[PDB]
Write a protein that binds this ligand. Structure first.
Ligand code: 0KF
Length: 303
């Protein structure tokens, strides 16, 4: 993957630089130790003379030059990745001296998918006036399909995600979901999804065994995380491994082949897809291209 050597990638200011005076900063959408994402109104960022609500990642009190460098690398990799319906897309950046580095991307109205799905437990029917804004199996399979599409796209750009999870999937209008990476804008030392392992705070419940045990990150470890994301979707935003202490024993049992049981809203095919994504052998997990085909088929079969 090339997303490990981002520093060599271009930042074409003539294309991407957006004047700070055309950006009206609003309320925070999330804050971490060193970073934050702010809602903003950007004047003419993507359509002439048109105000657009955007999401702006920038640093905050606590951040150092190290985080600034990291955010610049994120900007460069976003340019490299480019645009897809199912990825949060870069719209512009403010990089000029005299103000903070700001990475400006599409704003997703409904925010993170885990929180959203958890808010819809009382507004779900597998199939359907009364149920106008209800989620259905079609929605859940559709979100799954879309994330697979976005990951297939990221893979085509020779990138890997490394923190795939429902908290990093954002819901926009018209049931479009987008892969994001909140990164420094999340407080990982305070977020229970990130567990202390050594001197790192890691998303253990989403990590493939080879990642946990061997520090190996590949597109196939993202497929494992995608299986966990599927479980999150088909549990309507439940936390993975309910009633399991996330410790050395968990990791051992996981490596041994123990897996989550089927969540409440799954279809049998979807649960089997989860199990497939959780193959112990990375090369035996489906690829995102295969998942795209498969989920497209399940989405159609639902219709
Ligand atoms: C590498 C790499 C990095 C990224 C990346 O995504 N960077 C990124 C950049 C800027 C903001 C950001 O986070 C966002 C983005 C859109 C958004 N919309 C909401 N909406 C809400 O909160 C709603 C009120 C509920 C919240 N955000 N936060 C993520 N990628 C894809 N790859």
């Amino acid at each position: 993957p090339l997303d490990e050597h981002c520093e060599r990638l271009p930042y074409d200011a003539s294309k991407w630089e957006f004047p700070r005076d055309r950006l009206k900063l609003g309320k925070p959408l999330g804050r971490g130790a060193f970073g934050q994402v702010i809602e903003a109104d950007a004047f003419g960022i993507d359509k002439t003379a048109t105000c657009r609500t955007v999401a702006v990642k920038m640093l905050k009190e606590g951040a150092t030059h190290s985080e600034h460098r990291a955010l610049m690398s994120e900007l460069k990799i976003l340019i490299h990745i480019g645009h897809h319906l199912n990825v949060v897309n870069l719209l512009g950046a403010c990089t000029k001296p005299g103000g903070p580095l700001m990475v400006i991307v599409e704003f997703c109205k409904f925010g993170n998918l885990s929180t959203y799905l958890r808010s819809k437990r009382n507004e779900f029917v597998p199939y359907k006036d009364l149920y106008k804004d209800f989620l259905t199996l079609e929605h859940l399979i559709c979100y799954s399909f879309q994330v697979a599409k976005g990951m297939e796209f990221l893979a085509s750009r020779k990138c890997i995600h490394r923190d795939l999870a429902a908290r990093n999937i954002l819901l926009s209008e018209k049931n479009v979901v987008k892969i994001c990476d909140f990164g420094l804008a999340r407080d990982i030392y305070k977020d229970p999804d990130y567990v202390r392992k050594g001197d790192a705070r890691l998303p253990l419940k989403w990590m493939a065994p080879e990642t946990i045990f061997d520090r190996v990150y590949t597109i196939q470890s993202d497929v494992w995380s995608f299986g966990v994301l599927l479980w999150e979707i088909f549990s309507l935003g439940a936390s993975p491994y309910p009633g399991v202490k996330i410790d050395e024993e968990f990791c051992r049992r996981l490596k041994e082949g123990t897996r989550m049981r089927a969540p409440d809203y799954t279809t049998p095919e979807m649960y089997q897809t989860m199990l497939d994504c959780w193959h112990g052998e990375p090369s035996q997990r489906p690829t995102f291209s295969e998942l795209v085909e498969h989920l497209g088929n399940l989405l159609q079969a639902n219709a």
